[PDB]
């Protein structure tokens, strides 16, 4: 019973089985950028959220 | 009897009440602006046309209007990280100083001269990722005119500012509702689960 | 000096190793900056990064080939590819007679 | 909403788009003084740019 070519993300149908954002993090300083569309906005941990 | 009731309906008052993926508008064979309902709002993005070849002017004669008057603490930032506080009264100039600009190819502002500066607003806004700059922007007294593209004169560019106004859907409807030969488009529901509706340009 | 312009900018440093500020850095021809300096080249609220390789003029704009240090800028000014300019500011012009081909 | 047929003087409607203003460079004042009719206004340059 598993689509194969269609996935789920946390609201919806997508046919994107996996978003692989990729976040890079500042060497002098703690904060980690974005390494995709945003690039460039910080990155933050939500409230039991994952990022 | 056989009575055969019509349904003609899926008007854009009705379809934009269920919306949450992108929206887009276009008119015969020009530009096309698109939007998406995020929050209550339409994130529109005003792409300036580009329409060019070798003729870099026009995009800067589109944009210079938008600011067209003396201003200050304008923010240039070409390049990859420039930030500039720079002050424009018809010459590009920052703070006490006279910010040439040099590094054809490159298109820096070269604040300290390389003997091939010219320190003009029109050159800035040429170079400004508008010809040789990529994912650059000017700043300042509130927008952001950031380039899409670059020109290499044979591929076009773009300069774009993502207003975020025309985010009203109340003002999208009616846009909609009525315009040239614009022929819309919605895609709003599920990627998987969804299709487009176009709708009569004039209505 | 041959190709080692290291020494003569490490001559140059201790004239004015120390942290200080309003720095005059007058390289190319007309570039009359007024500029900071904490081991790192600086102007008031950006970041000053050196630019064109043969040219070397400073801009706080990046060209994809910044490196934005003052001992850069020393090798530089006058000293590695500049002709008739000056380090300026806290009361001394550096100029320079002479580059290094 | 604009016309390119009838343009405006700088006081009154005139079709001739362009008026050919003609200054003169003060030597020694570094200042263009008029010359065509108004013969010494001193010419400034306004906020948009133009003469």
Known sequence: GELTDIQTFDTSYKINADTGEVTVVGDNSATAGQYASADGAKVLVGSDGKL | ?203
Do not use: C, R
């Open chain 2, 1 to 203: 009897y056989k009575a055969t009731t019509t349904f003609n309906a899926a008007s854009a008052e009705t379809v934009l009440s269920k919306l949450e993926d992108g929206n887009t508008v276009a008119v015969g064979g020009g530009a096309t602006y698109t939007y998406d309902a995020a929050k209550g709002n339409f994130t529109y993005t005003k792409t300036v046309d580009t329409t060019v070849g070798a003729d870099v002017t026009a995009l800067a004669n589109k944009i210079k209007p938008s600011s067209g008057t003396i201003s200050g603490s304008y923010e240039i930032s070409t390049g990859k990280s420039a930030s500039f506080d720079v002050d424009a009264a018809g010459k590009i100039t920052i703070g006490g100083n006279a910010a040439f600009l040099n590094a054809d190819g490159e298109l820096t502002t070269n604040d300290a001269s390389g003997a091939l500066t010219q320190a003009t607003l029109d050159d800035v806004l040429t170079s400004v990722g508008t010809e040789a700059n990529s994912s650059v922007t000017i700043g300042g007294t509130k927008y952001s005119h950031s380039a899409a593209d670059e020109l290499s004169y044979t591929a076009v560019a773009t300069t774009a500012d993502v207003l975020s106004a025309m985010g009203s859907s109340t003002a999208v409807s009616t846009v909609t509702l009525g315009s040239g030969i614009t022929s819309a488009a919605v895609t709003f529901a599920i990627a998987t689960t969804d299709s487009n509706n176009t709708w009569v340009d004039n209505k």
